[PDB]
Design a protein around this ligand. Structure first.
Ligand SMILES: Nc1nc(=O)c2cc(CNc3ccc(C(=O)N[C@@H](CCC(=O)O)C(=O)O)cc3)cnc2[nH]1
Ligand SMILES: Nc1nc(=O)c2cc(CNc3ccc(C(=O)N[C@@H](CCC(=O)O)C(=O)O)cc3)cnc2[nH]1
Lengths: 182, 182
Protein backbone atom coordinates (compact mmCIF):
# COMPACT_ATOMS: atom_id res chain seq x y z
CA UNK A 1 0.00 0.00 0.00
CA UNK A 2 1.35 3.24 -1.47
CA UNK A 3 -0.09 6.72 -0.82
CA UNK A 4 0.57 9.44 -3.41
CA UNK A 5 0.07 13.12 -2.71
CA UNK A 6 1.32 16.62 -3.51
CA UNK A 7 1.02 19.14 -0.62
CA UNK A 8 1.63 22.84 -0.15
CA UNK A 9 3.80 24.39 2.55
CA UNK A 10 0.56 24.65 4.47
CA UNK A 11 -0.37 20.94 3.99
CA UNK A 12 -3.32 21.84 1.83
CA UNK A 13 -4.16 19.32 -0.85
CA UNK A 14 -7.26 20.97 -2.10
CA UNK A 15 -9.33 23.91 -2.85
CA UNK A 16 -12.86 23.88 -4.16
CA UNK A 17 -12.21 20.35 -5.35
CA UNK A 18 -9.08 21.28 -7.30
CA UNK A 19 -5.31 21.47 -6.79
CA UNK A 20 -4.84 24.78 -4.96
CA UNK A 21 -1.85 25.43 -7.29
CA UNK A 22 -1.68 26.00 -11.04
CA UNK A 23 -0.84 22.91 -13.10
CA UNK A 24 2.68 21.49 -12.84
CA UNK A 25 3.01 19.32 -15.95
CA UNK A 26 6.19 17.65 -14.68
CA UNK A 27 4.76 16.98 -11.29
CA UNK A 28 1.83 15.46 -13.09
CA UNK A 29 4.03 13.38 -15.36
CA UNK A 30 5.81 11.94 -12.30
CA UNK A 31 2.55 11.10 -10.50
CA UNK A 32 1.56 9.48 -13.79
CA UNK A 33 4.84 7.55 -13.93
CA UNK A 34 4.73 6.29 -10.33
CA UNK A 35 1.08 5.02 -10.23
CA UNK A 36 1.42 3.42 -13.66
CA UNK A 37 4.80 1.70 -13.61
CA UNK A 38 4.18 -1.89 -12.49
CA UNK A 39 7.21 -3.93 -11.30
CA UNK A 40 5.86 -7.26 -12.47
CA UNK A 41 5.51 -8.45 -16.04
CA UNK A 42 1.90 -8.35 -17.20
CA UNK A 43 0.49 -7.05 -13.87
CA UNK A 44 -1.34 -3.71 -13.47
CA UNK A 45 -1.55 -1.18 -10.65
CA UNK A 46 -4.77 -0.34 -8.87
CA UNK A 47 -5.57 3.26 -7.88
CA UNK A 48 -8.25 3.87 -5.19
CA UNK A 49 -9.80 7.29 -4.55
CA UNK A 50 -12.91 8.85 -3.09
CA UNK A 51 -15.87 10.19 -5.09
CA UNK A 52 -14.43 13.74 -5.09
CA UNK A 53 -11.01 12.92 -6.37
CA UNK A 54 -12.55 10.99 -9.23
CA UNK A 55 -14.69 13.97 -10.32
CA UNK A 56 -11.58 16.17 -9.92
CA UNK A 57 -9.66 14.42 -12.73
CA UNK A 58 -10.05 16.30 -16.06
CA UNK A 59 -13.06 14.36 -17.33
CA UNK A 60 -10.91 13.34 -20.28
CA UNK A 61 -8.28 11.20 -18.51
CA UNK A 62 -10.82 9.47 -16.35
CA UNK A 63 -10.25 6.60 -15.84
CA UNK A 64 -6.55 7.01 -15.23
CA UNK A 65 -4.91 5.18 -18.10
CA UNK A 66 -3.21 1.84 -17.85
CA UNK A 67 -4.51 1.46 -14.30
CA UNK A 68 -7.44 -0.22 -12.55
CA UNK A 69 -9.50 2.60 -11.11
CA UNK A 70 -11.51 1.82 -8.02
CA UNK A 71 -13.73 4.38 -6.23
CA UNK A 72 -14.80 4.30 -2.59
CA UNK A 73 -18.05 5.91 -1.54
CA UNK A 74 -20.75 4.79 0.92
CA UNK A 75 -23.29 6.77 -1.07
CA UNK A 76 -23.03 5.95 -4.76
CA UNK A 77 -25.14 2.98 -5.73
CA UNK A 78 -23.00 2.10 -8.73
CA UNK A 79 -19.57 2.88 -10.14
CA UNK A 80 -19.61 6.39 -11.58
CA UNK A 81 -18.96 6.06 -15.34
CA UNK A 82 -15.54 4.88 -16.52
CA UNK A 83 -14.87 3.49 -13.00
CA UNK A 84 -13.58 -0.08 -12.86
CA UNK A 85 -14.91 -1.10 -9.44
CA UNK A 86 -16.64 0.53 -6.47
CA UNK A 87 -16.31 -0.25 -2.71
CA UNK A 88 -17.87 1.43 0.34
CA UNK A 89 -14.77 0.94 2.43
CA UNK A 90 -11.01 0.92 2.28
CA UNK A 91 -11.09 -2.54 3.89
CA UNK A 92 -13.67 -3.97 1.49
CA UNK A 93 -11.54 -2.50 -1.32
CA UNK A 94 -8.41 -4.06 0.18
CA UNK A 95 -10.27 -7.40 0.49
CA UNK A 96 -11.32 -7.47 -3.12
CA UNK A 97 -7.72 -7.15 -4.34
CA UNK A 98 -7.22 -10.33 -2.27
CA UNK A 99 -9.59 -12.32 -4.53
CA UNK A 100 -7.10 -14.47 -6.48
CA UNK A 101 -8.63 -13.79 -9.84
CA UNK A 102 -7.77 -10.16 -9.02
CA UNK A 103 -4.52 -10.68 -7.09
CA UNK A 104 -3.03 -12.38 -10.13
CA UNK A 105 -3.61 -9.22 -12.18
CA UNK A 106 -2.71 -6.39 -9.72
CA UNK A 107 0.88 -5.47 -8.67
CA UNK A 108 0.88 -2.16 -6.73
CA UNK A 109 -2.06 -0.47 -4.95
CA UNK A 110 -2.03 3.38 -4.83
CA UNK A 111 -4.21 5.60 -2.77
CA UNK A 112 -4.74 8.96 -4.46
CA UNK A 113 -7.03 10.81 -2.06
CA UNK A 114 -8.92 12.62 -0.77
CA UNK A 115 -8.16 13.57 2.81
CA UNK A 116 -10.21 11.07 4.80
CA UNK A 117 -8.99 8.22 2.56
CA UNK A 118 -5.36 9.26 3.19
CA UNK A 119 -6.30 9.37 6.88
CA UNK A 120 -7.85 5.87 6.96
CA UNK A 121 -4.93 4.54 4.95
CA UNK A 122 -2.16 6.18 7.01
CA UNK A 123 -3.38 4.43 10.15
CA UNK A 124 -3.93 0.98 8.66
CA UNK A 125 -1.60 -1.47 10.41
CA UNK A 126 0.88 -2.75 7.79
CA UNK A 127 3.80 -1.79 5.54
CA UNK A 128 2.92 1.62 4.10
CA UNK A 129 4.94 3.95 1.88
CA UNK A 130 4.12 7.69 1.43
CA UNK A 131 5.22 9.40 -1.82
CA UNK A 132 4.93 13.17 -0.96
CA UNK A 133 5.62 16.17 -3.24
CA UNK A 134 6.67 19.19 -1.14
CA UNK A 135 5.30 22.25 -3.00
CA UNK A 136 7.37 24.96 -1.33
CA UNK A 137 4.83 27.82 -1.33
CA UNK A 138 1.55 28.53 0.42
CA UNK A 139 -1.76 28.07 -1.25
CA UNK A 140 -5.24 28.60 -0.03
CA UNK A 141 -6.74 25.25 0.80
CA UNK A 142 -9.97 23.95 2.23
CA UNK A 143 -8.65 20.34 2.53
CA UNK A 144 -5.44 19.22 4.18
CA UNK A 145 -3.10 16.29 4.52
CA UNK A 146 -2.48 14.84 8.01
CA UNK A 147 0.65 15.18 10.12
CA UNK A 148 3.16 12.51 9.00
CA UNK A 149 3.86 10.97 12.44
CA UNK A 150 7.58 10.69 12.89
CA UNK A 151 7.14 7.99 15.52
CA UNK A 152 5.99 5.81 12.65
CA UNK A 153 7.38 7.13 9.36
CA UNK A 154 10.93 7.42 8.09
CA UNK A 155 12.15 9.41 5.13
CA UNK A 156 14.04 7.39 2.58
CA UNK A 157 16.96 9.63 1.59
CA UNK A 158 16.97 7.49 -1.55
CA UNK A 159 14.50 6.10 -4.02
CA UNK A 160 14.95 4.35 -7.34
CA UNK A 161 13.07 6.58 -9.80
CA UNK A 162 12.88 9.75 -7.66
CA UNK A 163 15.34 12.63 -7.99
CA UNK A 164 16.58 14.28 -4.82
CA UNK A 165 17.12 17.85 -5.97
CA UNK A 166 14.67 20.70 -5.78
CA UNK A 167 12.48 21.19 -8.82
CA UNK A 168 10.79 24.29 -10.11
CA UNK A 169 7.85 24.95 -12.43
CA UNK A 170 6.23 28.31 -13.14
CA UNK A 171 8.31 29.82 -10.30
CA UNK A 172 7.26 27.04 -8.03
CA UNK A 173 9.84 24.84 -6.37
CA UNK A 174 9.03 21.41 -5.07
CA UNK A 175 10.73 18.20 -4.06
CA UNK A 176 9.76 14.53 -3.92
CA UNK A 177 10.10 12.69 -0.63
CA UNK A 178 9.51 9.05 0.24
CA UNK A 179 8.46 7.94 3.76
CA UNK A 180 8.05 4.37 4.96
CA UNK A 181 6.54 2.46 7.85
CA UNK A 182 6.05 -1.15 8.98
CA UNK B 1 -29.82 -16.14 -13.47
CA UNK B 2 -29.48 -19.93 -14.14
CA UNK B 3 -29.78 -22.75 -11.59
CA UNK B 4 -28.86 -26.28 -12.78
CA UNK B 5 -29.60 -29.44 -10.77
CA UNK B 6 -30.38 -33.21 -11.07
CA UNK B 7 -33.05 -34.65 -8.70
CA UNK B 8 -34.04 -38.16 -7.80
CA UNK B 9 -37.77 -38.85 -7.63
CA UNK B 10 -37.71 -38.13 -3.93
CA UNK B 11 -36.14 -34.66 -4.58
CA UNK B 12 -32.78 -35.84 -3.30
CA UNK B 13 -29.63 -34.09 -4.52
CA UNK B 14 -26.94 -35.59 -2.29
CA UNK B 15 -25.91 -38.49 -0.08
CA UNK B 16 -22.97 -37.98 2.31
CA UNK B 17 -21.54 -35.08 0.23
CA UNK B 18 -21.88 -36.95 -3.05
CA UNK B 19 -24.56 -37.51 -5.67
CA UNK B 20 -27.10 -40.07 -4.54
CA UNK B 21 -26.80 -42.01 -7.83
CA UNK B 22 -23.86 -43.63 -9.63
CA UNK B 23 -22.36 -41.32 -12.27
CA UNK B 24 -24.18 -40.63 -15.45
CA UNK B 25 -21.34 -39.73 -17.81
CA UNK B 26 -23.80 -38.25 -20.28
CA UNK B 27 -25.62 -36.18 -17.60
CA UNK B 28 -22.23 -34.76 -16.43
CA UNK B 29 -21.60 -34.01 -20.15
CA UNK B 30 -24.77 -31.93 -20.22
CA UNK B 31 -24.10 -29.95 -17.00
CA UNK B 32 -20.61 -29.33 -18.39
CA UNK B 33 -21.61 -28.08 -21.85
CA UNK B 34 -24.37 -25.89 -20.49
CA UNK B 35 -22.24 -24.36 -17.78
CA UNK B 36 -19.21 -23.86 -19.94
CA UNK B 37 -21.00 -22.47 -23.02
CA UNK B 38 -20.93 -18.71 -23.46
CA UNK B 39 -22.84 -16.59 -25.97
CA UNK B 40 -19.84 -14.26 -26.25
CA UNK B 41 -16.27 -14.62 -27.33
CA UNK B 42 -13.81 -13.45 -24.69
CA UNK B 43 -16.50 -13.82 -22.01
CA UNK B 44 -16.85 -16.78 -19.61
CA UNK B 45 -19.64 -18.13 -17.44
CA UNK B 46 -19.54 -17.90 -13.69
CA UNK B 47 -20.30 -20.79 -11.37
CA UNK B 48 -21.33 -20.04 -7.75
CA UNK B 49 -21.63 -22.98 -5.30
CA UNK B 50 -21.77 -23.44 -1.56
CA UNK B 51 -18.72 -24.77 0.31
CA UNK B 52 -20.01 -28.34 0.58
CA UNK B 53 -20.51 -28.41 -3.19
CA UNK B 54 -17.09 -27.04 -3.83
CA UNK B 55 -15.67 -29.98 -1.87
CA UNK B 56 -18.01 -32.63 -3.28
CA UNK B 57 -16.24 -31.97 -6.68
CA UNK B 58 -13.51 -34.52 -7.26
CA UNK B 59 -10.40 -32.50 -6.42
CA UNK B 60 -9.00 -32.77 -9.99
CA UNK B 61 -12.09 -31.40 -11.51
CA UNK B 62 -11.50 -28.43 -9.24
CA UNK B 63 -12.03 -25.79 -10.14
CA UNK B 64 -14.43 -26.34 -13.06
CA UNK B 65 -12.29 -25.77 -16.18
CA UNK B 66 -13.35 -22.91 -18.54
CA UNK B 67 -15.42 -21.37 -15.81
CA UNK B 68 -14.80 -18.78 -13.14
CA UNK B 69 -15.45 -20.60 -9.84
CA UNK B 70 -16.97 -18.76 -6.96
CA UNK B 71 -17.40 -19.94 -3.38
CA UNK B 72 -20.11 -18.91 -0.96
CA UNK B 73 -18.82 -19.18 2.60
CA UNK B 74 -19.93 -17.35 5.73
CA UNK B 75 -16.92 -18.53 7.70
CA UNK B 76 -14.17 -19.73 5.40
CA UNK B 77 -11.25 -17.45 6.10
CA UNK B 78 -9.86 -17.25 2.60
CA UNK B 79 -10.76 -18.82 -0.69
CA UNK B 80 -10.23 -22.52 -0.99
CA UNK B 81 -7.30 -23.63 -3.07
CA UNK B 82 -8.17 -23.17 -6.69
CA UNK B 83 -11.43 -21.21 -6.30
CA UNK B 84 -11.42 -17.88 -8.22
CA UNK B 85 -13.47 -15.71 -5.86
CA UNK B 86 -15.00 -16.00 -2.39
CA UNK B 87 -18.16 -14.25 -1.25
CA UNK B 88 -20.28 -14.62 1.87
CA UNK B 89 -23.76 -14.53 0.38
CA UNK B 90 -25.40 -14.80 -3.05
CA UNK B 91 -25.84 -11.02 -2.69
CA UNK B 92 -22.18 -9.99 -2.70
CA UNK B 93 -21.40 -12.52 -5.43
CA UNK B 94 -24.13 -10.92 -7.59
CA UNK B 95 -23.01 -7.39 -6.68
CA UNK B 96 -19.52 -8.56 -7.47
CA UNK B 97 -20.94 -9.37 -10.81
CA UNK B 98 -21.99 -5.84 -11.69
CA UNK B 99 -18.46 -4.43 -11.19
CA UNK B 100 -17.62 -3.05 -14.62
CA UNK B 101 -14.35 -4.82 -15.02
CA UNK B 102 -16.07 -8.01 -13.83
CA UNK B 103 -19.19 -7.57 -15.88
CA UNK B 104 -17.33 -7.42 -19.18
CA UNK B 105 -15.60 -10.74 -18.51
CA UNK B 106 -18.67 -12.66 -17.52
CA UNK B 107 -21.58 -13.85 -19.59
CA UNK B 108 -23.76 -16.29 -17.69
CA UNK B 109 -24.26 -16.95 -14.05
CA UNK B 110 -25.02 -20.52 -12.96
CA UNK B 111 -25.89 -21.66 -9.48
CA UNK B 112 -24.63 -25.18 -8.90
CA UNK B 113 -25.84 -25.71 -5.34
CA UNK B 114 -26.40 -26.59 -2.64
CA UNK B 115 -29.87 -26.71 -1.24
CA UNK B 116 -29.53 -23.47 0.70
CA UNK B 117 -28.16 -21.65 -2.36
CA UNK B 118 -30.63 -23.03 -4.86
CA UNK B 119 -33.40 -21.82 -2.54
CA UNK B 120 -32.01 -18.30 -2.00
CA UNK B 121 -31.51 -18.10 -5.79
CA UNK B 122 -35.02 -19.38 -6.51
CA UNK B 123 -36.74 -16.71 -4.49
CA UNK B 124 -34.49 -13.93 -5.68
CA UNK B 125 -36.26 -11.35 -7.86
CA UNK B 126 -35.56 -11.19 -11.60
CA UNK B 127 -35.48 -13.45 -14.60
CA UNK B 128 -34.51 -16.87 -13.44
CA UNK B 129 -34.38 -20.18 -15.18
CA UNK B 130 -34.04 -23.62 -13.55
CA UNK B 131 -32.49 -26.47 -15.57
CA UNK B 132 -33.85 -29.65 -13.89
CA UNK B 133 -32.75 -33.20 -14.75
CA UNK B 134 -35.34 -35.56 -13.23
CA UNK B 135 -33.66 -38.91 -12.35
CA UNK B 136 -36.61 -41.25 -12.68
CA UNK B 137 -35.86 -43.34 -9.62
CA UNK B 138 -35.74 -43.10 -5.82
CA UNK B 139 -32.34 -42.75 -4.18
CA UNK B 140 -31.71 -42.46 -0.48
CA UNK B 141 -30.64 -38.89 0.21
CA UNK B 142 -29.84 -36.41 3.01
CA UNK B 143 -30.09 -33.25 0.88
CA UNK B 144 -33.23 -32.23 -0.95
CA UNK B 145 -33.98 -29.71 -3.63
CA UNK B 146 -36.30 -26.89 -2.60
CA UNK B 147 -39.73 -27.52 -4.17
CA UNK B 148 -40.54 -25.32 -7.20
CA UNK B 149 -43.36 -22.78 -6.87
CA UNK B 150 -45.62 -23.46 -9.84
CA UNK B 151 -47.36 -20.21 -9.07
CA UNK B 152 -44.13 -18.53 -10.19
CA UNK B 153 -42.17 -20.99 -12.33
CA UNK B 154 -43.46 -22.27 -15.70
CA UNK B 155 -42.33 -25.38 -17.53
CA UNK B 156 -41.01 -24.60 -21.00
CA UNK B 157 -42.05 -27.40 -23.41
CA UNK B 158 -38.81 -26.97 -25.39
CA UNK B 159 -35.72 -24.77 -25.05
CA UNK B 160 -32.81 -24.66 -27.50
CA UNK B 161 -30.04 -27.08 -26.77
CA UNK B 162 -32.28 -29.32 -24.61
CA UNK B 163 -32.90 -32.86 -25.89
CA UNK B 164 -36.60 -33.62 -25.59
CA UNK B 165 -36.44 -37.38 -25.25
CA UNK B 166 -36.45 -39.48 -22.10
CA UNK B 167 -32.86 -40.65 -21.60
CA UNK B 168 -31.46 -43.81 -19.97
CA UNK B 169 -27.88 -44.60 -18.86
CA UNK B 170 -26.74 -47.56 -16.72
CA UNK B 171 -30.43 -48.63 -16.81
CA UNK B 172 -31.52 -45.40 -15.21
CA UNK B 173 -33.95 -43.05 -16.93
CA UNK B 174 -33.72 -39.30 -16.82
CA UNK B 175 -35.35 -36.32 -18.47
CA UNK B 176 -34.15 -32.72 -19.05
CA UNK B 177 -36.46 -29.88 -17.96
CA UNK B 178 -36.20 -26.08 -17.90
CA UNK B 179 -38.28 -23.78 -15.67
CA UNK B 180 -38.65 -20.03 -16.12
CA UNK B 181 -39.81 -17.19 -13.91
CA UNK B 182 -40.08 -13.48 -14.68
N1 LIG C 1 2.21 13.95 -6.82
C1 LIG C 1 0.94 14.03 -6.90
N2 LIG C 1 0.44 14.97 -7.80
C2 LIG C 1 -0.90 15.13 -8.05
O1 LIG C 1 -1.24 15.97 -8.89
C3 LIG C 1 -1.81 14.26 -7.27
C4 LIG C 1 -3.16 14.37 -7.46
C5 LIG C 1 -3.90 13.54 -6.74
C6 LIG C 1 -5.40 13.56 -6.81
N3 LIG C 1 -5.95 14.28 -7.99
C7 LIG C 1 -5.62 14.04 -9.30
C8 LIG C 1 -6.24 14.87 -10.27
C9 LIG C 1 -5.98 14.67 -11.60
C10 LIG C 1 -5.08 13.68 -12.00
C11 LIG C 1 -4.72 13.39 -13.41
O2 LIG C 1 -5.23 14.02 -14.33
N4 LIG C 1 -3.88 12.41 -13.67
C12 LIG C 1 -3.44 12.09 -15.11
C13 LIG C 1 -2.53 13.28 -15.48
C14 LIG C 1 -1.13 12.86 -16.17
C15 LIG C 1 -0.91 13.94 -17.30
O3 LIG C 1 -2.06 14.14 -17.78
O4 LIG C 1 0.16 14.48 -17.55
C16 LIG C 1 -2.74 10.79 -15.25
O5 LIG C 1 -2.82 10.24 -16.39
O6 LIG C 1 -2.08 10.30 -14.30
C17 LIG C 1 -4.50 12.90 -11.02
C18 LIG C 1 -4.76 13.07 -9.65
C19 LIG C 1 -3.25 12.66 -5.85
N5 LIG C 1 -1.95 12.53 -5.68
C20 LIG C 1 -1.25 13.35 -6.43
N6 LIG C 1 0.10 13.24 -6.22
N1 LIG D 1 -27.53 -31.53 -14.23
C1 LIG D 1 -26.78 -31.49 -13.19
N2 LIG D 1 -25.86 -32.57 -13.03
C2 LIG D 1 -24.98 -32.66 -12.01
O1 LIG D 1 -24.23 -33.67 -11.94
C3 LIG D 1 -24.93 -31.50 -11.09
C4 LIG D 1 -24.01 -31.52 -10.09
C5 LIG D 1 -24.01 -30.46 -9.25
C6 LIG D 1 -23.05 -30.44 -8.13
N3 LIG D 1 -21.95 -31.43 -8.11
C7 LIG D 1 -20.98 -31.63 -9.10
C8 LIG D 1 -20.01 -32.65 -8.84
C9 LIG D 1 -19.01 -32.88 -9.77
C10 LIG D 1 -18.93 -32.18 -10.99
C11 LIG D 1 -17.94 -32.36 -12.06
O2 LIG D 1 -16.99 -33.15 -11.96
N4 LIG D 1 -17.96 -31.74 -13.18
C12 LIG D 1 -16.98 -31.75 -14.27
C13 LIG D 1 -16.82 -33.00 -15.13
C14 LIG D 1 -18.24 -33.46 -15.79
C15 LIG D 1 -17.91 -34.75 -16.65
O3 LIG D 1 -17.11 -35.49 -16.02
O4 LIG D 1 -18.40 -34.92 -17.79
C16 LIG D 1 -17.11 -30.52 -15.22
O5 LIG D 1 -16.16 -30.26 -16.02
O6 LIG D 1 -18.20 -29.93 -15.14
C17 LIG D 1 -19.90 -31.18 -11.16
C18 LIG D 1 -20.92 -30.89 -10.23
C19 LIG D 1 -24.98 -29.44 -9.50
N5 LIG D 1 -25.86 -29.37 -10.45
C20 LIG D 1 -25.80 -30.48 -11.26
N6 LIG D 1 -26.75 -30.50 -12.27
Amino acid sequence: LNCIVAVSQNMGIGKNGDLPWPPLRNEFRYFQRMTTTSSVEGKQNLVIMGKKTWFSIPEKNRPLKGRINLVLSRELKEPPQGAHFLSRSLDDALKLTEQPELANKVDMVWIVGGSSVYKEAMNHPGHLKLFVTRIMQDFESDTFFPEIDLEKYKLLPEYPGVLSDVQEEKGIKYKFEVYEKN
